Design a protein around this ligand. Structure first.
Ligand SMILES: [Mg+2]
Ligand SMILES: [Mg+2]
Ligand SMILES: [Mg+2]
Ligand SMILES: [Mg+2]
Ligand SMILES: [Mg+2]
Ligand SMILES: [Mg+2]
Ligand SMILES: [Mg+2]
Ligand SMILES: [Mg+2]
Ligand SMILES: [Mg+2]
Ligand SMILES: [Mg+2]
Ligand SMILES: [Mg+2]
Ligand SMILES: [Mg+2]
Ligand SMILES: [Mg+2]
Ligand SMILES: [Mg+2]
Ligand SMILES: [Mg+2]
Ligand SMILES: [Mg+2]
Ligand SMILES: [Mg+2]
Ligand SMILES: [Mg+2]
Ligand SMILES: [Mg+2]
Ligand SMILES: [Mg+2]
Ligand SMILES: [Mg+2]
Ligand SMILES: [Mg+2]
Ligand SMILES: [Mg+2]
Ligand SMILES: [Mg+2]
Ligand SMILES: [Mg+2]
Ligand SMILES: [Mg+2]
Ligand SMILES: [Mg+2]
Ligand SMILES: [Mg+2]
Ligand SMILES: [Mg+2]
Ligand SMILES: [Mg+2]
Ligand SMILES: [Mg+2]
Ligand SMILES: [Mg+2]
Ligand SMILES: [Zn+2]
Lengths: 105, 187, 159, 53
RNA sequence: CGAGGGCGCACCACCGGCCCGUCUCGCCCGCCGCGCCGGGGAGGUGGAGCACGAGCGCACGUGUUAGGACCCGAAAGAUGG
RNA sequence: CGACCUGGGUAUAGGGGCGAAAGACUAAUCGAACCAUCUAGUAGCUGGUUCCCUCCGAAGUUUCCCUCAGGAUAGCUGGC
RNA sequence: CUCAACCUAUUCUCAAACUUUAAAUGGGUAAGAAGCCCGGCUCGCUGGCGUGGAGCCGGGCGUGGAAUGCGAGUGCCUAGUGGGCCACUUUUGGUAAGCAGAACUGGCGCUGCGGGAUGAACCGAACGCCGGGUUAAGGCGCCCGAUGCCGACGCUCAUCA
RNA sequence: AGUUUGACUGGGGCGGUACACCUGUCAAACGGUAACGCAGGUGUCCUAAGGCGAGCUCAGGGAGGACAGAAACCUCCCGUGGAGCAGAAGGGCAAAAGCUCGCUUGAUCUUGAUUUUCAGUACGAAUACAGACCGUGAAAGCGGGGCCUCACGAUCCUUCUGACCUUUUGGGUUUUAAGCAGGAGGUGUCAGAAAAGUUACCACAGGGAUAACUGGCUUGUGGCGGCCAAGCGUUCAUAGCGACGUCGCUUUUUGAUCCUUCGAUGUCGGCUCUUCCUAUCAUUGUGAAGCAGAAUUCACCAAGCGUUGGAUUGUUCACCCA
RNA sequence: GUCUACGGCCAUACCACCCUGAACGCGCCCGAUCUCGUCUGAUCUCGGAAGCUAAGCAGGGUCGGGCCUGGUUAGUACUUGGAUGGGAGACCGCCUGGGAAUACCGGGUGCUGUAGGCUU
């Protein structure tokens, strides 16, 4: 799919439709001090081996793309997450399509 | 052969008190005669309530009895309850009531008598009105019991507001998955 | 083994009648539906919005709610050994007024008129419908003409 | 296996509890022994208060 | 006996009302702390709620469960000899 | 007449020993001895489950489950 | 002159995954008192309009508005079961099967009894202990209850009837 | 050293996925309805192929026009859709839902209700509203994704976003952490364990719920017959045969099934021995011939009697010698 | 008796060809300055009124096609329920009720609402 890099959509802080910058959300780095990670490290230390399941049975080939909208209002930089459907190829602000054009020879 | 079904032949109802209380059995003997030998339907209702179990004879508070006897046209009538009359400490003034009950709490009895009221047992009521004339036959709240909060549709079904059976109440006891949209679903 | 698709087995059920395709006639949008009237659920397939499920095609219900384009209908549905009153939102293209209620409401007004006239005039008239009684005794005239004799025809191989 | 409506019960009887069971058949005897010791102590401290300080 | 009429128990259906959470809208009030303070309203919606208590203790029955667990039954595993 | 047969004395002990090797032998037990204990181990599997009369009286189907010899669930049953 | 294709008007034969038409059996709803008809009141909804809609408050109407039958409503707790099988009919795979798989009703399972010699299911009929009467399905040479009727009319000879 | 090494399944394995879904049919004119039933499809794709508005008409054909032809573009006429609408199929659709333009982001922020599967649980998907903020159009309106039916995912954990929000334990400040609300990272065995083999050295609990051997149903296949008679038979359908078709029987073949047996019915062949069957090889008595005789072939009554010795091979079968 | 504007049902209204059309109307028609769109004032938009019913439109016609409605087909096909009916079967008959569809043969060829005109 191809979503433009800018869209005018509802901003919850402004309470109205505003222009937004559109980027692709990427998962942040793990904290190592999240409570679940702290519990995992304590559980794993010592003898006993692997104490939690390791999935290793992958079936999906795609992910739901998440767009991070940022309100371009200078005072309100409020962010939001929109999920769109699954797609194998994702393009941000790519070239648009034209109808009456000659396909490359 | 006859094309009939026999699964509803035997009607399930109390034909006698399951209690062995001989004082209850004596005034069951009294009202069994009254129901049979009069045409009063009051005696039939009183007799069938004498058979009834305790959960089917809930206590009647003083406030509820006062409220039902204060309705227009019920003055100088005998409030009859087949069960216990219970004191209510949420009422401040007790009017002059004439009551007939199976049991009356010690404090409810003292309050009624101080107000100038009268308390009758069911044999005194039979003498005072064998046909049950001039009476207000009252009942306690039948569904005012904790079991009825758990009865109904299952708690895990939509639009059901029935209490679940939990050993303890707190934020860790049956509040996550199936109770809020943030944990799976809510319904 | 059967799929659970919402429109499985509705190939003819939602198809338009022969030479009745095209634009939906506008009087179907001009019918007035109020709370409490009886409506048959058809389910035409030209309009894909507000379509009732295939189990409600041919069922009759009672309107309980009116919106801009649809109505809410309380319609009975039989599920195994119990019947339970479903409430469905159906756009008005897929419903029409049930004439069974119209016929009965007509008969009520006629009955109340007939009682009113009979009381003011001094008569008693049967108002209940009675089932078709046994035929009365009558005379059949031959009109001087003997009944025509009928005999079974001989067999022959037609073709 | 759960059956219809009920309470999720978690009995703590997975740990060989039958080998550590305290019965109380010596409770009436313990009350007698404590009572006798109380009386003996009061006799020992003759005019002093029987309870203590 | 009795057409009609009346007060209506319990309970059921429905409509209102009140309490806590959370939204939306909006205007007022309080004062030793004039505050990034405190209180209040209307309209939806979430609660195992209120709406003149019904529980507690004891006994019995049935059902479910943890225990050797209705009775008998493995191939095995472990500790020490 | 030999890498021969054999007594007695010694050494090696159980996931160990010993094997010119067959998973052989290790007290009639060996692809892990025997003894006691943990232990009445667990079993969705097989077998059994003790007096009389009266009344009512089924299911082998729905949905979910590493579910298919089992359960939960609805249904059908009885009792109050 | 002739044969093709093409077109036109006809003609033979078909369709579980074709169809104009279109049954039988079947599915839903209605057959009143919570109804009908009068007046009024409320609304922040709707709006040319005292307009619409809904709600509420009074009043008057009983020939109780098809047949037939039946006393209903409602709650709690709950066992067993969750291998099924058979028959008429419809029906899928298979050459077929006492095969495998569906639909409907009934049955067996859980069920004895009369008959089919015999038999889980067929036909009749379902059951407390008995006497008398009468039947069902089926029978009435003898086994073996009952034709030991002066039964009626035909058909049939088989050296595998 | 510990543990695991899915399920369904006309036994199991191999093969497939009938394991989560969608279309038509089965399906017996409501709905529902099975098999490793039939014909197929899905794990995507799309800033437009989403949302409005406007203007147009599509497939195909006929007739014409320089190059230009059977297909290049232009023109007229006919054209109920015979095209197109992303994809499988079905439905639907014509100043449409198709094509081309213009403007856009309703594919946004929210609370409930409902439908579908259904236990009337969830997820997914969908329907009708209500409250915001927008788009488009002159407006009525239409739009909170794709014309409809499919295109997907719990707890725990992680990660991001939001409240000048709550807690962070004697008080305060600040980092940090925990929380509340909403997205995402996924479990395809798709209501969601973290998982390779081998055993003939094997073990146990069971199973005739389930295979290997008999028996039973069936008889496709095997075997043996019949009907018709185009032909073969120097001629001549039928002495002897019998193509194209068609009707049967048999259970000495092999399948099909899984009813009995898994707290056991000893599983091939030979040897030995008895009996039975007839669809008769010989012998007895016969009929027919393309029966001169001899020999042979066909058929009838017929199972009384006989049907052998050996080489090779475990063989049954086979083949050869006599 | 008709028409116009807006319609309801959506062919008894459609399609092919022919004839007639008074009056209003509806059109065809004339032009591009403005408004507005085009490759093209053809369409659309605008400004008109010389001419014409040739066309559209209306009415009528056709042993017209279609469509609508009847008869026939036909108590046929199929079918609910029943039998210890028949038949080796395949299937068939009867009892009890329901009951079609072609071909073929007839008739018909828009009704109508609101508002506003014309018709001696
Ligand atoms: Mg019984
Ligand atoms: Mg309420
Ligand atoms: Mg229980
Ligand atoms: Mg035991
Ligand atoms: Mg182990
Ligand atoms: Mg070996
Ligand atoms: Mg043991
Ligand atoms: Mg078993
Ligand atoms: Mg079967
Ligand atoms: Mg059984
Ligand atoms: Mg039974
Ligand atoms: Mg029986
Ligand atoms: Mg018998
Ligand atoms: Mg027999
Ligand atoms: Mg008798
Ligand atoms: Mg006999
Ligand atoms: Mg005899
Ligand atoms: Mg014969
Ligand atoms: Mg059907
Ligand atoms: Mg159906
Ligand atoms: Mg358009
Ligand atoms: Mg909105
Ligand atoms: Mg849509
Ligand atoms: Mg699953
Ligand atoms: Mg010849
Ligand atoms: Mg078997
Ligand atoms: Mg079987
Ligand atoms: Mg043996
Ligand atoms: Mg033997
Ligand atoms: Mg012979
Ligand atoms: Mg014609
Ligand atoms: Mg018939
Ligand atoms: Zn903003």
């Amino acid at each position: 799919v191809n979503v433009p890099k800018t869209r005018r959509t509802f901003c919850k802080k402004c309470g109205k439709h505003q222009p937004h910058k559109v980027t692709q959300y990427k998962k942040g780095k793990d904290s190592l001090y999240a409570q679940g990670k702290r519990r995992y490290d304590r559980k794993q230390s010592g003898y006993g081996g692997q104490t939690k399941p390791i999935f290793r049975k992958k079936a999906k080939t795609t992910k739901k793309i998440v767009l991070r909208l940022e309100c371009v209002e200078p005072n309100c930089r409020s962010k939001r997450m929109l999920a769109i459907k699954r797609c194998k190829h994702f393009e941000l602000g790519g070239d648009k399509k034209r109808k009456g054009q000659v396909i490359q020879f | 052969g006859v094309d009939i079904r026999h699964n509803k032949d035997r009607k399930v109802r109390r034909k006698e008190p399951k209690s062995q209380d001989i004082y209850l059995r004596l005034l069951v003997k009294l009202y069994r005669f009254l129901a049979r030998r009069t045409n009063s339907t009051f005696n039939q209702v009183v007799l069938k309530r004498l058979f009834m179990s305790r959960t089917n004879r809930p206590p009647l508070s003083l406030s509820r009895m006062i409220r039902k006897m204060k309705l227009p046209g019920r003055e100088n009538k005998t409030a009859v309850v087949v069960g216990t009359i219970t004191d209510d400490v949420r009422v401040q003034e007790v009017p002059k009531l004439k009551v007939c009950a199976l049991r009356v709490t010690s404090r409810a009895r003292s309050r009624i008598l101080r107000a100038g009221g009268k308390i009758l047992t069911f044999d005194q009521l039979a003498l005072d009105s064998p046909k049950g004339c001039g009476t207000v036959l009252l009942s306690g709240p039948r569904k005012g019991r904790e079991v009825y909060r758990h009865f109904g549709k299952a708690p895990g079904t939509p639009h059901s507001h029935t209490k679940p059976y939990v050993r303890s109440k707190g934020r860790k006891f049956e509040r996550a998955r199936g109770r809020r949209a943030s944990r799976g679903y809510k319904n | 083994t059967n799929t659970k698709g919402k429109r499985r087995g509705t190939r003819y059920m939602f198809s338009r009648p022969f030479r009745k395709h095209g634009v939906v006639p506008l009087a179907t949008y001009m019918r007035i539906y109020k709370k409490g009237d009886i409506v048959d659920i058809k389910g035409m397939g030209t309009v894909q919005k507000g379509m009732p499920h295939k189990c409600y095609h041919g069922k009759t219900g009672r309107v309980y709610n009116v919106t801009q384009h649809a109505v809410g209908i309380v319609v009975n549905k039989q599920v195994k050994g119990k019947i339970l009153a479903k409430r469905i939102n159906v756009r008005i293209e897929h419903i029409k007024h049930s004439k069974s209620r119209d016929s009965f409401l007509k008969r009520v007004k006629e009955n109340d008129q007939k009682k009113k006239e009979a009381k003011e005039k001094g008569t008693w008239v049967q108002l209940k419908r009675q089932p078709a009684p046994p035929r009365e005794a009558h005379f059949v005239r031959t009109n001087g003409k003997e009944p025509e004799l009928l005999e079974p025809i001989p067999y022959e191989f037609m073709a | 296996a759960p059956s219809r409506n009920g309470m999720v019960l978690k009995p703590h009887f997975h740990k060989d509890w039958q080998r550590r069971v305290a019965t109380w058949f010596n409770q009436p005897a313990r009350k007698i022994r404590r009572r006798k010791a109380r009386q003996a102590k009061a006799r020992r401290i003759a005019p002093r208060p029987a309870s203590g300080p």
